[PDB]
Structure 1
């Protein structure tokens, strides 16, 4: 619930995620703006050339009702997806480390 930001836009999610004191891996889950029914996991990242940046991963819907970023790793809920990537990056730009503040 804490990390579910609902109908926040892609750019508003970037504004919040790009706060300079957010550790790398700060994230939120939102409804996708461009794919109705899908969600997005937006994560803060960083590299030493470009600096702070946000990576967006579309979370698409399954026919069983599940969710997935890559079809190779499907979940029965967004809570299960968030718990999984908080445990290990498994291909994400970085492990989910902190829920995006306020």
Structure 2
């Protein structure tokens, strides 16, 4: 996974908001990094825009089932992280926006 373009490893929540919040990035720009807060979990950080708050980043915890798979909600589970990224690029399913560009 270290060689996945979208995996940024151990950056913090505040580093990921600085990397993403760029007023020249499309809505849905994202990255996957490790959760600082929950050992063993990952986190999908996604840039969003709404009228009021403007540009902001949403963070979604990704948990790993002990049998192996990954999930953000009870709707779908994925046998790998790349399957999760691939799925949410085509279907937002509760996320603020489908995933569009990897963080530059």
TM-score range, shorter chain: over 0.9
Question: Residue 82 of structure 1: SS of its match in structure 2?
Answer: helix
1:71 offset after TM fit, Å? 2.6
Moved over 6 A (4+): none
Q: CA–CA distance in 1 between the matches of 2:33 and 2:84?
A: 13
Does residue 1:40 correspond to 2:43, yes or no?
yes
Question: Residue 75 of structure 1: SS of its match in structure 2?
Answer: coil
Deviations 1:55-94 (A, max 9, x none): 0000011021111111321111110000000011111100
Q: CA–CA distance in 1 between the matches of 2:41 and 2:13?
A: 13
Q: CA–CA distance in 2 between the matches of 1:60 and 1:100?
A: 21
Q: CA–CA distance in 2 between the matches of 1:98 and 1:89?
A: 14
Q: CA–CA distance in 2 between the matches of 1:75 and 1:19?
A: 30
Q: What TM-score do you get using the length of structure 1 for normalisation?
A: 0.96
Q: CA–CA distance in 2 between the matches of 1:72 and 1:87?
A: 15
Question: Residue 52 of structure 1: SS of its match in structure 2?
Answer: strand
Which residue of the partner structure matches residue 28 of structure 1? 31
